[PDB]
Structure 1
Amino acid sequence: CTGLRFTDDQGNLYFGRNLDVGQDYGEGVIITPRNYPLPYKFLDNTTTKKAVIGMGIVVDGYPSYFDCFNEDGLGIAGLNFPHFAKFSDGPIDGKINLASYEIMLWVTQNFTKVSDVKEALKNVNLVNEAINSSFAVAPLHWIISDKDEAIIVEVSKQYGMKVFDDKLGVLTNSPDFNWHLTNLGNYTGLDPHDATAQSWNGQKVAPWGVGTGSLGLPGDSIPADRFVKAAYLNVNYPTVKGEKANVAKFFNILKSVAMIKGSVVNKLGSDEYTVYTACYSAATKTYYCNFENDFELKTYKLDDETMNADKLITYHHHHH
């Protein structure tokens, strides 16, 4: 998995992710309308006040999102953080206690600004607790973004709860976010500008084509390598104008660091690959995605009809 965000020139946000998995989770697009029942394990039950859209599954009427985005332009994506993620073994007195899966809707239902999320997370405790008996707790970390800033939320057995500002606009998987940030200093030799002809003791040594400035840029799917590549691409990609160009830019970057089917076989014998790429445009309230076996962009929208529906709106699962 790779998460990505950036803005156009006028602060319109484009924010999304690749889902890179080794099995089928049965997910599909889900629109949660306003005034939908919203239970909490350790807080008063309530109802949604904001409509949200994203990809996920429905568990006894609870929309469990892999990524979701509210009508006000703030979203969150959950990505794998194995060997690090570890939540509290029980709620703590005086904290805002959330089972780790509840963070998706807690963030999208109560906030519109990342700066506010940041202040609220100072009294939040994430609890190691599953939705129900037949689910395990997923070892996730999260990227949260509005149009002004993105933060990384990580709760690990190594370091506890840490919240990072993410100026690169990217997130992958393990190890922890500061490790990845530190790793970038080893890639300062990268340069978009091509090299030119040289004399190696009088032997002409010259580029055969363009691209020689990025010698050393990794192209495999190791999380640290996708991180370096996605970060490099995102910060050097110019700002572009309009919905079509920005959506295209989003998919150009994430299809570049996609995990290609057949190139990764996990230790259990299964292919791991990017099953879908998705982008939320806050300006149009539109969720764009495509699939490993179906490349044309699909669109799903928060609008006056869907934001006010009486039930969840769920699209059949796209068969991988």
Structure 2
Amino acid sequence: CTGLALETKDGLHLFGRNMDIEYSFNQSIIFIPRNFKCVNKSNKKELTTKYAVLGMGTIFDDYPTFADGMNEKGLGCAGLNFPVYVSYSKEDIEGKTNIPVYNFLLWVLANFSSVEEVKEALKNANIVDIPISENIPNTTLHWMISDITGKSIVVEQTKEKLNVFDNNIGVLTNSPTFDWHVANLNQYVGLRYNQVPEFKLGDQSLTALGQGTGLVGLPGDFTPASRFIRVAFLRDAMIKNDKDSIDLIEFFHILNNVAMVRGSTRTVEEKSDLTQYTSCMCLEKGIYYYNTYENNQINAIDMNKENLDGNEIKTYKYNKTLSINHVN
């Protein structure tokens, strides 16, 4: 998975992610109106939304759970794989605000209007364990969260504490911890976006064979560490050189560079790990844009076209049928 936040030329804030998995999870686009009571049947825990919510997720026994999404106030959240350095509690911890893993994303979007508000409540940070239905393998996720102010945070629970990092890079991938990746960026201070055309190697003239010589040493593989480096510098270069050109499609160009391709990232179970979908949320406008591995045309779902005071959850079918424009 790769997360990304970006500000457009018109001053709008985009937030989204690549979902990188080798399987389907019965996902669909889920809309939840405000003042809507969600009740988990397996453990009888309930949640009533304060704000309307839209994003990608799935439904277990009528209970919604999200992979990423936004609310009507322009707060966004995305849950990304975090397999090694995560540690949830096996049961509730006394005195803490205990949040079940599966419910964290909805908890953020349903209750809060800004990053600053989320930050105070997370101090409170508790990604313990709790199921949802009857079974299911409750995993992990390393959190961020972004809003209309342009500020982003990353949320990671380790064995010692629930960590909340200010994210000044504007990106996230997977393991290891966020502070590891930030220090790793320092290894690449020698990268240059500008062409290096020549090098006088004593008696030998060295001339660049093509464009791109300044970035030689950029890692090309699909590990979380390498993808973090690539997206961080690609984002930086566009802001530095092309702040006034940034729009929706640029978000997709950045994430395409770190997208997984069929065949080349094989798991030990011999399945292909893919970038299954790419989402981009325009936070001010309440529009969830996404495309999929099967269909690259961007699909838009606008929450403002729904009844925010409605009484039903609405779902939209995950689009995996390629849409072509037939010109003649």
What is the identity, as a one-letter code, of the residue corresponding to 1:19?
Answer: M
Q: Corresponding residue for 1:14?
A: 14
Alignment of 1:1-320 (within 5 A): 1-9=1-9, 11-39=11-39, 45-148=46-149, 149-157=151-159, 159-238=160-239, 240=243, 246-318=247-319
Question: Could you say what secondary structure the match of 2:88 adopts?
Answer: coil
For residues 38-61 of structure 1, give each alpha carbon's deviation from its aligned partner in whole angstroms, at most 9, with x where no partner exists.
347999734212111111101122
For residues 76-106 of structure 1, give each alpha carbon's deviation from its aligned partner in whole angstroms, at most 9, with x where no partner exists.
1000000111111211222111112221111
Question: Could you say what secondary structure the match of 1:143 adopts?
Answer: coil
Q: Distance in 2 between matches of 1:304 and 1:108?
A: 19
Structure 1 pair 112–11 and aligned structure 2 pair: CA distance change class (3 A): farther
Q: Distance in 1 between matches of 2:258 and 2:28?
A: 23
Question: Could you say what secondary structure the match of 1:288 adopts?
Answer: strand
Question: Could you say what secondary structure the match of 1:20 adopts?
Answer: strand
Structure 1 pair 287–192 and aligned structure 2 pair: CA distance change class (3 A): same
Superposed displacement of residue 145, structure 1: 0.4
Question: Could you say what secondary structure the match of 1:231 adopts?
Answer: helix
Superposed displacement of residue 221, structure 1: 0.5
Q: Which deviates more, 268-277 or 120-129?
A: 120-129
Q: Distance in 2 between matches of 1:171 and 1:121?
A: 19
Q: Distance in 2 between matches of 1:183 and 1:276?
A: 27
Structure 1 pair 316–304 and aligned structure 2 pair: CA distance change class (3 A): closer
Superposed displacement of residue 223, structure 1: 0.4
Please provide the CA RMSD for this pair: 2.0
What is the identity, as a one-letter code, of the residue corresponding to 2:155?
Answer: V
Calculate the TM-score normalised by the size of structure 1.
0.93
For residues 267-296 of structure 1, give each alpha carbon's deviation from its aligned partner in whole angstroms, at most 9, with x where no partner exists.
110000101111000132111111111111
Q: Distance in 2 between matches of 1:132 and 1:44?
A: 11
Question: Could you say what secondary structure the match of 1:232 adopts?
Answer: helix
What is the identity, as a one-letter code, of the residue corresponding to 1:76?
Answer: C
Q: Corresponding residue for 2:325?
A: none
Q: Distance in 1 between matches of 2:47 and 2:176?
A: 36
What is the identity, as a one-letter code, of the residue corresponding to 1:183?
Answer: N
Q: Distance in 2 between matches of 1:119 and 1:43?
A: 27
Superposed displacement of residue 152, structure 1: 0.4
Q: Distance in 1 between matches of 2:244 and 2:312?
A: 36
Q: Distance in 1 between matches of 2:298 and 2:320?
A: 16
For residues 16-75 of structure 1, give each alpha carbon's deviation from its aligned partner in whole angstroms, at most 9, with x where no partner exists.
000110111110111111121134799973421211111110112221000010011001
Q: Distance in 1 between matches of 2:292 and 2:110?
A: 28
Superposed displacement of residue 241, structure 1: 5.4
Aligned-residue sequence identity (percent) comes to: 38
Structure number with higher strand proportion: 1
Question: Could you say what secondary structure the match of 2:304 adopts?
Answer: coil
What is the identity, as a one-letter code, of the residue corresponding to 1:155?
Answer: Q
Superposed displacement of residue 11, structure 1: 4.2
CA contact (8 A) 1:53 1:69 kept: yes
Question: Could you say what secondary structure the match of 2:78 adopts?
Answer: strand
Q: Distance in 1 between matches of 2:298 and 2:45?
A: 39
Structure 1 pair 91–56 and aligned structure 2 pair: CA distance change class (3 A): same
Q: Which deviates more, 64-73 or 1-10?
A: 1-10
Calculate the TM-score normalised by the size of structure 2.
0.91
Question: Could you say what secondary structure the match of 1:303 adopts?
Answer: helix
Q: Distance in 2 between matches of 1:43 and 1:207?
A: 65
